[PDB]
Amino acid sequence: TVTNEFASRFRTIVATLANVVNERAVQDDMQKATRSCTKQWLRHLETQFD
Amino acid sequence: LKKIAESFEDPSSIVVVLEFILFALFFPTEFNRIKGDIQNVLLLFFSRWY
């Protein structure tokens, strides 16, 4: 398979955590920079995971 | 095609897409010769971004 289901599941998981950490980030009025940095680390974990 | 190990994790990865478009302008012929192999990369781009 071109796509790996075990990895795609981790993909959706990470999208969910992105929404969650996003809401917590905006609730605590933290800087845009750190917020996008969290998202970047998350998508990196996504890649490593595949 | 010479191998291109792009993950397309970051927007900067658009560079690789440009690299192809340019290659398809200057060299439509070789492009048409290897475009399937290019498509393998473009699908990694498209599955992430869209």
From Swiss-Prot, chain A:
<protein>
    <recommendedName>
        <fullName>Inner capsid protein VP1</fullName>
    </recommendedName>
</protein>
<comment type="function">
    <text>Inner capsid protein that self-assembles to form an icosahedral capsid with a T=2 symmetry, which consists of 120 copies of VP2, with channels at each of its five-fold vertices. This capsid constitutes the innermost concentric layer of the viral mature particle.</text>
</comment>
<comment type="subunit">
    <text>Homodecamer; each decamer is made up of two conformers of VP2, called VP2A and VP2B. 12 homodecamers assemble to form an icosahedral capsid.</text>
</comment>
<comment type="similarity">
    <text>Belongs to the turreted BTV-fold inner capsid family.</text>
</comment>
